[PDB]
Amino acid sequence: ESAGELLVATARTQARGEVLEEVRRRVREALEALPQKPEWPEVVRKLALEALEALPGAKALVANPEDLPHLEALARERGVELQAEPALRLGVRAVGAEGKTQVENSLLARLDRAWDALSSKVAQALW
Amino acid sequence: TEALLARYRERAEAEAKAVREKAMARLDEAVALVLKEVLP
Amino acid sequence: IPGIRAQIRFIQQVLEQREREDTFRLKRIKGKIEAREAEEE
Amino acid sequence: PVQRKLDPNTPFLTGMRILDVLFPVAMGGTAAIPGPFGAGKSVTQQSLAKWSNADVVVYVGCGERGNEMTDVLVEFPELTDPKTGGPLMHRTVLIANTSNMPVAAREASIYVGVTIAEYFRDQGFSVALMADSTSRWAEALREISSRLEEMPAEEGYPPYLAARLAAFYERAGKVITLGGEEGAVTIVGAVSPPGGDMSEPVTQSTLRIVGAFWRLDASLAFRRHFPAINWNGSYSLFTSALDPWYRENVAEDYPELRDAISELLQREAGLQEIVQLVGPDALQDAERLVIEVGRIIREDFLQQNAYHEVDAYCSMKKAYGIMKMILAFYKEAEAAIKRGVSIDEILQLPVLERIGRARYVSEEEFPAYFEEAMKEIQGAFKALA
Amino acid sequence: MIQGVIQKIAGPAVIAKGMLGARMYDICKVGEGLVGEIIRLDGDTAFVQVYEDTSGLKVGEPVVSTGLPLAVELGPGMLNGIYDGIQRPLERIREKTGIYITRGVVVHALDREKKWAWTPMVKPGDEVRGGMVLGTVPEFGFTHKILVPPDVRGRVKEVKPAGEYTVEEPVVVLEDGTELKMYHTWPVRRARPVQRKLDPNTPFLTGMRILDVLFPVAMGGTAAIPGPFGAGKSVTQQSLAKWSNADVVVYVGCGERGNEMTDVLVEFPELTDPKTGGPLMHRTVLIANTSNMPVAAREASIYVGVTIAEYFRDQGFSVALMADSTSRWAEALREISSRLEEMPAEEGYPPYLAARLAAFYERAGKVITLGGEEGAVTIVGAVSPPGGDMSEPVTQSTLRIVGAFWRLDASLAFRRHFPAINWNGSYSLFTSALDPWYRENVAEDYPELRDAISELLQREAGLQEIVQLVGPDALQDAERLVIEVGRIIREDFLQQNAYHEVDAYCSMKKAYGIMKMILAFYKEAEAAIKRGVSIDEILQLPVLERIGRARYVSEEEFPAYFEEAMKEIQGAFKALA
Amino acid sequence: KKEYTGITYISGPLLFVENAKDLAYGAIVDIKDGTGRVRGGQVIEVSEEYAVIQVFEETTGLDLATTSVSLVEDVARLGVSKEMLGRRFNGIGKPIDGLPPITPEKRLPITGLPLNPVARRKPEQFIQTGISTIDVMNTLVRGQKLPIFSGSGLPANEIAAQIARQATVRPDLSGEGEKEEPFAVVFAAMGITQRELSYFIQEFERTGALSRSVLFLNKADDPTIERILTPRMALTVAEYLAFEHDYHVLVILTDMTNYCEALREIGAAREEIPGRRGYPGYMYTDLATIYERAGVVEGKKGSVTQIPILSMPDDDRTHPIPDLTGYITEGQIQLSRELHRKGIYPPIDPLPSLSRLMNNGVGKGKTREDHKQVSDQLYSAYANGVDIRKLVAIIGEDALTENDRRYLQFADAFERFFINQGQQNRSIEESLQIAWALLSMLPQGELKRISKDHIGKYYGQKLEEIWGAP
Amino acid sequence: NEIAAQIARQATVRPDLSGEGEKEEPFAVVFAAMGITQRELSYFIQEFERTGALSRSVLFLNKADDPTIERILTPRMALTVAEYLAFEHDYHVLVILTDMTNYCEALREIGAAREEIPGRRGYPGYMYTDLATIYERAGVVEGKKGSVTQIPILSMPDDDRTHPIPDLTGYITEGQIQLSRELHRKGIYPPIDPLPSLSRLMNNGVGKGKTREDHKQVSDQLYSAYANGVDIRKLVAIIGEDALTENDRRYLQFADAFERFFINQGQQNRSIEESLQIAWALLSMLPQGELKRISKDHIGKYYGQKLEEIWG
Ligand SMILES: Nc1ncnc2c1ncn2[C@@H]1O[C@H](COP(=O)(O)OP(=O)(O)O)[C@@H](O)[C@H]1O
Ligand SMILES: [Mg+2]
């Protein structure tokens, strides 16, 4: 006789999950549409410098072929090797000096790492 | 006495529709907040 | 009753002795593997 | 992979009275048969392979004698499949790895057998998988770990033995296949603890996973009383879920008869404690009657001759009739005891011979034999009084 | 100050490099700083056993060695307080952190903010030795004496005038530059020195007739009791704490379960000191550890408690120390030993369990303090083996060094007999040494009365087979008389109500009077039986009511009641004839 | 996203990675292989040379040239919320009910901090479990740790589910008369099979008890570290609810024997010397840390109650697991194989069962004033009847007195009606009424353990109670 | 050793019962000794000289004063010779191993010298496989007339059936013949204890066309009656003997007569017919109603014969 309340709760939970999924999809679209914006070179500059400073010393720096024109200047400034790799997208990868350690700063990884934390904030703000 | 669940089913459907229509009106603000927070 | 008690204590002593021997063998193998991995340099 | 796991509702008919009645195992469940050497594990597994109602039977000879494999190979082709009537070997897949074969191949044999069973389940059949001994698998793992120079957990076994056993046993179950059909795998594995010690870690690890447990007894084997299953040390967790099937397909009051038999056995076991203390003659008439009924149940119902042309297979209805006869005789005997009749007079009543010989009656003559025996039982007490 | 960095983390064991010169058993701060203990030295490497959880630590974090072993702070402010296994006040921890004990918290055992009324007793230019008295501080009605540390010698250069000061104030400065405060530190694993240890020739009055008479314990002796459930051990311990000779009571929990410790913590503050109107907690120190607290605290709580007791008796008082469950401490010791991969001796216990138990129990005794005054420590440690088996190694090791054993029994409590000490299993070894004191201070015939009572109880216990087979009414006159005398003894002398206003405490004189009355009545009854009087007539005499109400008579009004009852005992038999 | 690729050694559950000193001890990491599959692990040992990681799953397909290890979290933590009620989890916080993942209000370390002894208070009130044998003779008190000692084939799961879906609080009996305090149930399952999982899911769904329950379910084929982590996560959720939202929480642990076996396997995998009977030497401390998280706190209206369940290996009470469990907890409930074989459910044996906190949970302001006397009289009478039933076998019925026959009939009726309640949900008043009806079979003067007032007020009722609920 | 020598001396097939033709092929004995003493070796040599079996016997002798490591290779060489003979020249081989305990001792010594992880009581973990590689070399091969029969001998330490050596041997072999010390102390020879003994391949050579048709039922009835007598012995040891029912007295007397006549046979050779006749005479001590494991036809054909009529 009280199962209708449970079904209502499940429906509300499914609606909340659908709303969160829609927000995720919109944020994903906004992130993947970034390389068409004038702020994109500055974002990749920030990613490159953050990756290079996270490792105390980087033997080489890996960048996307479309990203290297906007980061070659500080690639030469920092004195690290530049190497091209088609597979990388929306970020740069820095390889440690010893070659055993590598750091990745793609925007997809950042979104994956931060969405689980900002889910509570966006749920509080939206409703 | 076997048709009690239909009214609860339709009430749950109405609640879900109300929740989604309420949430649709504020998606852009949340998306902007997420973009502001993620981007350094 | 006393015979059963004596049998019980005898069995307990035997089991405890076997457990102690197994523990000593485990410590021996740990010590010898440590010695090998240390002297291999 | 499978679509979904289903709840077990149909029983796995092994053809043995004690296993089919007292400790049933459902289609898609698991069972274990531990015991010392010479207790009758291999003969029991061969009996299940010959007489079970599974579509396909997969037999894994993990680290046991080769003569068993030779016996199976020689004898199975001359037998007939109970379902289709063709040769029995046409439904059997045999994986053999004898004692003198390489040690590392036992794990491979177990995995190959269970994978073949899973594939035949995926085809939509009902597969029964029987492993000859997982103790040899544990010993092979111990030998491999010793060669690896690992740290043993207990009695030399590697730490992951319990995890491997659980992974092997969790493959069984009744499923909805990826093609939309329905199939099931039933796994029955024998355990051979060293020295018959049931506290050995393999037996304890198995005991916490299987849904049915069939413990063997050395004393019963010494008396040549087979199948020599320790009633006190066994159990089954599928009894409650299989009750509707028993009601629908066997008889309406089958669970009540099974419960009555179990209660009588429990009372006899309880009275045995006083019997071994003060002797059988120190009891009253009712206690002596209970002891005699327990003896009759043990010798005429639980017992089964695996080498007999008729007693080897016993359907559910035959066992139901036998237990109904035993219960009716017990009721009449206790009623007569309330009337002052001496216990010694009851024990010489000729219907006991009929009850004892009812086990050897063929599956065709049983329907009339049961009626005649019930009428004789009623006459021996009601008409006499 | 030796400093190093973390080299290697594996469970609770931390390896630190660059720690050359670190002493063997110093306490270390590991991490940002968790408390640890050095257990091994190897080159520049030291092995540290961290007390608390090490999750979250990283290689390269600082390691600082304090340079001192585990020690307690001895000084004013310990009474009326509750401490954990390593002397951390729980009240201030709760105030700082809330309901949980967050790791890495640091507090001081003695409050540094409270002000005490200093009162010097020394003058400039006076030579001072270890253990001498420097001053006086009032504390809840006690005269707390500031003592020189045992290993300090010199002469006084200056002394501060009387006033208000904190424990950190250097009240006395020696001519060598040494500054003496109101407190000092002492390692918990070293016994405090004494001038001389005296012989056990004085009794420890418990206030319970059975323990004070049948199984006495000497002042400074050791006793052990079982802890079976339902036997009323807690009320017995509370009565002992309330009515003992000790001026100061020290209670150690050492790893008991949570709810029992909660009951102990909520029961003592509601107890009242019999000698005044205030609560008993003003002369009690509580050490509490639950079974989920760090194992090192549970292992060191016993030593902390015994060291505090040693300090308090060094001040010149009598101290009663109660270890709640030495079995839990033995379990903690076994766990610590297993952490070191030591070879177990018997049933998993380390081979040095007996040595540790002896080292703990031998700190008890009555000694002449370094100040020349008398003090003592009495230890009553309870053992509660799992299953109640007395063959368990901890019980065997304990019974070989204790001087008394008071076997609590659940069967006696089941039939509503209290304080439920089984007289068949209990025994004591202090009777011979205490006999002269009994003759001097109680009566010249006290040992004879005690032996007569014990013999009567033994004879009553010897007949239990026949009275159980055929019943009491089938016996002869002498057997029935013995049974009834034993029943009267059990119901009027051994039994005692702890909650009763006047029956809670019994002096030696009242017990002696009751024993003499019982023996006289037994003699008169046997004489009447010899004169042909029926047993039923004897069992209906009115003086039995006077005997039964004896234990409920006030202490000061007892002698008149005793004289009247003694006169009535001889009157009732001779006059009736 | 930090990535370490200096792996130099793989064997069994352990793998070594080089130049990874940034990994904190006890952290959670995930291993990614060439095929892209991601499997998790925990850091066991870290030093300047290399770090040691124990893999959750099997290490098939790993290689030293293509795999990589990345950090997930410094310390194992769980995200809790007040909306976790009605959800199912796999034991590491992953939902398995198909609903969207919860939004965590806050994240808490699963290895919770010990309670301050001076902050606890004395347990005072009881829990109505709906079972007469537990409610009357072995009363459960809010804040007690009362384990259930089961066997091999005994129906422990059925009793656990029945208690979970029947337990409730009784504020009216204490005088409050309002359901102000919410009630919640936390269910933890360790090393269960598929059949047990399906049974638990069906039982919780079919009666509506899921709306107030949180389930942490760990299968038998799941990684053992998940089995280790399940009780800690369950207790973290329970403590959060009780001490931050004034909930009354009942925690049920399905099988502590599986937990002990998993702990032994984990200890052996890290090359540690076992203690007694091959079990780890720190088993007592681990079990104490699990059990001691329950209790009641001064200044808080919430409470936590635990009912651990364990199967004795060989029906031995001297085995280390039940021995330590009884050495830590405050009693036990003993299941009897004889009663189960005689068709009695639930097969709880009153004679060896015990509750050490019952005297606090009963009285005049709670339950009823005659609770304790009725309980002890029932215990004594049942013991006497059971003892007489053994002698009647040899000496016959006619050689007994009238009192012996009355005791025998009382014991038989007690076993038939009191213990064998089936699936009924008996309140405390109904159980007391049944007990008084059973006691009315004995003579008036035979009730030596009860005061005359209660006897005069309640004696004389006939047996017409169990027939009111077939 | 006496039982082994008697078996080697008296062993023979019965082709007439099986109708296989009177081939009458003598057995070839391959004898392998491991750490045997001088007394036992001299006894075996004297017995083989007396029976004239040395003309068709291969001996591999490893005396107790020989090095302990040589015991590793002796059984393998003996079984290699036996296999070669049987499967290349159609011989019938009876292999006797003097003592497997010495072989296990040598194996444990080698394992401890190499620091293997032990099993129970220090024995190496691969002892099961090592013993299987020796025991499982016997049998009959399809398409060949040869045969290899193995009769290992081992002494249980302290008469412990749970010791690793006898336990693994039972787990590998096809049964065992267990001797009882109590029977030996009562003067019964051979002291073969029937209850713990077992023959796994017993039913493959008994039936209608093989030996006699009543073999299996008589064996089962004998086992049941002996077990009943053994239980009644404990009952008599517990309570007074005068309280026994007549059935209990009958079972007790049957057990005593069984021990004194069927088991204790001395150094004489019994044909299968004589053994069956003695078994039926012993079973005749019980009423016909108690023979529940024997069909009525065999009872009618054989029951009733007197024990004293066999010899007098
Ligand atoms: N059900 C049975 N009916 C008749 N004889 C049996 C039965 N079970 C076992 N036996 C006998 O007991 C022997 C036991 O050997 P086996 O079954 O191979 O034991 P295990 O599997 O323990 O090695 C069988 O060879 C057979 O002679
Ligand atoms: Mg077999």
Author numbering:
A (entry chain J): 61 to 187
B (entry chain I): 81 to 120
C (entry chain G): 169 to 209
D (entry chain A): 194 to 578
E (entry chain B): 1 to 32, 34 to 578
F (entry chain D): 5 to 474
G (entry chain F): 161 to 472
What did the article's authors report about this structure?
V/A-ATPase is a motor protein that shares a common rotary catalytic mechanism with FoF1 ATP synthase. The V1 domain of Tth V/A-ATPase (A3B3D1F1) is an ATP-driven rotary motor where the central DF shaft rotates inside the hexameric A3B3 containing three catalytic sites, each composed of an AB dimer. When powered by ATP hydrolysis, the V1 domain rotates the central rotor against the A3B3 hexamer, composed of three catalytic AB dimers adopting different conformations (ABopen, ABsemi, and ABclosed). Here, we report the atomic models of 18 catalytic intermediates of the V1 domain of V/A-ATPase under different reaction conditions, determined by single particle cryo-EM.
To determine the ATP-waiting structure of V/A-ATPase, we prepared a cryo-grid with a reaction mixture containing 4 µM enzyme, 50 µM ATP, and the ATP regeneration system, pre-incubated for 300 s. Hereafter we refer to the structure as V2nuc. We also obtained the V2nuc structure in which ATP and product(s) are bound to ABsemi and ABclosed, respectively, but ABopen is empty. The V2nuc is therefore assumed to be the structure of the protein awaiting ATP binding to ABopen. State2 of V2nuc returns to state1 via state3 of V2nuc by the same process.
